[PDB]
Amino acid sequence: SHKQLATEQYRHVEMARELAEQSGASSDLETDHQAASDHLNLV
Amino acid sequence: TIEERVKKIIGEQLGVKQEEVTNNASFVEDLGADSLDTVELVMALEEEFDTEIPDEEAEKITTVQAAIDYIN
Amino acid sequence: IQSLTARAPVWLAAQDTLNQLCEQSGETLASSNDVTEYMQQLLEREREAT
Amino acid sequence: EMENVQKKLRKLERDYYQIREQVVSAKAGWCAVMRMVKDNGVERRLHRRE
């Protein structure tokens, strides 16, 4: 169980990292879509 | 020196004295310690040094000298 | 393992009695036929000593 | 959850530590008894392997 927990910790960290990147991407997309809503209202 | 630990513990675990053990011999058959006795010896060595030895490495102590080789 | 475990104690008791018996004698037994032939030698010694 | 299992590992480790002291201390006495018993008792009289 000790070695299993070490391995599981490593994998868990990897998944957390890729989700952090997607969170940043989501904020960027929100910026772009705010601009998009403004454009719709302008048209 | 620090080896006095091993060369002491071995005897205390096998009934032989400090000088009885010979580096050329093997615990499994040349000291009379069977499977259970050798498990007890390796596990007592583990206890004394407050460390850990997995099964694979632990199985490589059949000879007298090995008890110090992994230690020092 | 269950079969062997059930069988073991009987075999061990039998072996202790056998070792005691043959050690009590000068000759060491190894088989049923061997025990029988030892019976016969014992009878011959009876009928000479008598 | 996995951090709490790690703390389980620590608790189990100290349990193992306790068991280990038990084992080594027991052997220390086994040594002495089997030293003294070699006055022919262990041969078959005390060692009732049945």
Swiss-Prot record, chain B:
<dbReference type="GO" id="GO:0006633">
    <property type="term" value="P:fatty acid biosynthetic process"/>
</dbReference>
<keyword id="KW-0596">Phosphopantetheine</keyword>
<keyword id="KW-0597">Phosphoprotein</keyword>
<dbReference type="Pfam" id="PF00550">
    <property type="entry name" value="PP-binding"/>
</dbReference>
<dbReference type="GO" id="GO:0031177">
    <property type="term" value="F:phosphopantetheine binding"/>
</dbReference>
<comment type="pathway">
    <text>Lipid metabolism; fatty acid biosynthesis.</text>
</comment>
<feature type="domain" description="Carrier">
    <location>
        <begin position="1"/>
        <end position="72"/>
    </location>
</feature>
<dbReference type="InterPro" id="IPR036736">
    <property type="entry name" value="ACP-like_sf"/>
</dbReference>
<dbReference type="GO" id="GO:0009245">
    <property type="term" value="P:lipid A biosynthetic process"/>
</dbReference>
<keyword id="KW-0443">Lipid metabolism</keyword>
<comment type="subunit">
    <text>Interacts with MukB.</text>
</comment>
<dbReference type="GO" id="GO:0009410">
    <property type="term" value="P:response to xenobiotic stimulus"/>
</dbReference>
<keyword id="KW-0444">Lipid biosynthesis</keyword>
<keyword id="KW-0276">Fatty acid metabolism</keyword>
<dbReference type="GO" id="GO:0000036">
    <property type="term" value="F:acyl carrier activity"/>
</dbReference>
<feature type="modified residue" description="O-(pantetheine 4'-phosphoryl)serine">
    <location>
        <position position="35"/>
    </location>
</feature>
<dbReference type="InterPro" id="IPR003231">
    <property type="entry name" value="ACP"/>
</dbReference>
<dbReference type="InterPro" id="IPR009081">
    <property type="entry name" value="PP-bd_ACP"/>
</dbReference>
<dbReference type="GO" id="GO:0000035">
    <property type="term" value="F:acyl binding"/>
</dbReference>
<dbReference type="InterPro" id="IPR006162">
    <property type="entry name" value="Ppantetheine_attach_site"/>
</dbReference>
<comment type="similarity">
    <text>Belongs to the acyl carrier protein (ACP) family.</text>
</comment>
<keyword id="KW-0275">Fatty acid biosynthesis</keyword>
<dbReference type="GO" id="GO:0005737">
    <property type="term" value="C:cytoplasm"/>
</dbReference>
<dbReference type="GO" id="GO:0008610">
    <property type="term" value="P:lipid biosynthetic process"/>
</dbReference>
<keyword id="KW-0963">Cytoplasm</keyword>
<dbReference type="GO" id="GO:0016020">
    <property type="term" value="C:membrane"/>
</dbReference>
<dbReference type="GO" id="GO:0005829">
    <property type="term" value="C:cytosol"/>
</dbReference>
<dbReference type="GO" id="GO:0008289">
    <property type="term" value="F:lipid binding"/>
</dbReference>
<comment type="function">
    <text>Carrier of the growing fatty acid chain in fatty acid biosynthesis.</text>
</comment>
<protein>
    <recommendedName>
        <fullName>Acyl carrier protein</fullName>
    </recommendedName>
</protein>
